[PDB]
Write a protein that binds this ligand. Structure first.
Ligand code: ZN
Ligand code: ZN
Ligand code: ZN
Ligand code: ZN
Lengths: 160, 163, 160, 163
């Protein structure tokens, strides 16, 4: 019996660290694990499309995807793997800097056995944060960056 | 300061109870609460029925804490929740995440990017007795909205869903 | 395979409501449930000692105990039931009005498969609350009461 | 305002990772953090070894956020955490809840009544592959403290624990 777990949150909330905590519990217990990272940001492979790691993923028990929002192919990938009998764990930002859905990641929710959304700390007033604020003027969805270009932010701070 | 909490789950997972437990905590500490139910689901603190949350906007505006039950049925929910939360209110939404076909139910998933907290609850599988994440329709009707209970639907794991 | 789940929290945090949410999921799925309430505050029975409901508990699949802190007998009761193959779910206050362990309830933690501690809302400043404050001067552990005698309180408020 | 978060679990459940994820959130937002490890467990942001948390009291006093790893080994933990939390600090404690015999480990359970949050984590059973809630000692030593890893211990469910 396979499954899909989803780990949502803004930036700076530790989504990857949670994905890995989870994946490692299976590894220290001698399951074959694979962990897939977005090329542009136990086996561990960088990728831009999940097709590039599908045949490899078929040969393991536990799959982790970091930054799932960047993988247009993610919903079909996960559903097939889980139906293949694999444990699939996905870290993905829930929203863009506009607080809109980020890629195809939320269509994973109806298919997932578990869903959680983690918390950051507001970089502007130090309450809990659920959103990511883009600090500059660019308006395209994909702008790779860290605390240089982005602030994890609460609702008040978001709208300042 | 205002916020949106979201409670997802299959049918039979207690989303309404969890919604009432949260709202009641604020009420016993003397907040004004309002719970909104969907008018057309009658299979059984201000409590009010609604068909479009616009119906109850002025009543909502006069309270601290607002619960929305069966939130998948309100096509205006994003706009309503976001506006209330922005005015200072705590908003808590119980809602099914997927239809009988396991596809987004209504507009409810657009609330995720706007929400401070999101949980997904667990039912127990009515066919094998593992944990259940999905709802299966027993009959053959194909329209999305069919009000009903265990008569019409089973809470179901991945395995049983596809049997 | 049986288990023990523990639901801790201060007063006014909905522990009973959570216990029942959990128990009801099993009932609507046609398991025999029993729910045991403290006599002094689906089958539902009031009790002062769990020995009075043990033989009955043997005949069901899912057992709930509300106010487990009041049952001196609780640890042995739960462990035996769970080892009998039953799902045992326990709501219990974690601490007294002095923030000390309340009865034998924390010896359930090492034996429990799951443990959570819920939150109330501070009745004095309206932040989250983890503690119960006794409003009057009595110093005995057991004083049955509601928001008449007690306030759910945060750490600051506790120490005012 | 100060607080005590507690992370329990069997061995192999990631309590340390969860501890670091929480602490790192405060650090990336420019808080001063301190992580304390138990000196005698060397089987591999201020990080410091300790045997009694009194050792590191003055270093602790100069930071916003303090993590305590393997907290079951510090016989002074209640007093330390409660004092720091009362002085304004956020304190987060990873610790095992039970010994190899499933009895309270150290003083750690007395922290529960003082804590704002308590979670118990899950390992995976090393013998049947269900979820694991307990730790079993493979050998026959009977003293409580025996530093070691998968060599000496298995993370285990109720069923396998008693096999
Ligand atoms: Zn802020
Ligand atoms: Zn099933
Ligand atoms: Zn307070
Ligand atoms: Zn096992």
């Amino acid at each position: 019996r396979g499954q899909i777990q989803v780990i949502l949150g803004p930036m700076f909330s530790g989504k990857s660290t949670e994905l890995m905590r989870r994946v490692r519990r299976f590894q220290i217990a001698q399951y074959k694990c694979l962990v897939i990272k977005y090329a542009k940001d136990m086996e561990a492979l960088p990728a831009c499309l999940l097709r590039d790691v599908a045949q490899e993923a078929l040969g393991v028990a536990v799959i982790g995807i970091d930054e799932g929002q960047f993988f247009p192919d993610i919903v079909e990938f996960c559903e097939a793997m889980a139906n293949a009998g694999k444990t699939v764990i996905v870290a993905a930002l829930d929203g863009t800097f506009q607080r809109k859905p980020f890629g195809a990641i939320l269509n994973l929710v109806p298919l997932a056995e578990s869903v959680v959304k983690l918390t950051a700390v507001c970089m502007e007033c130090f309450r809990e944060a659920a959103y990511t604020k883009r600090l500059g003027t660019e308006k395209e969805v994909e702008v790779i960056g860290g605390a240089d270009k982005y602030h994890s932010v609460c609702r008040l701070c978001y709208f300042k």
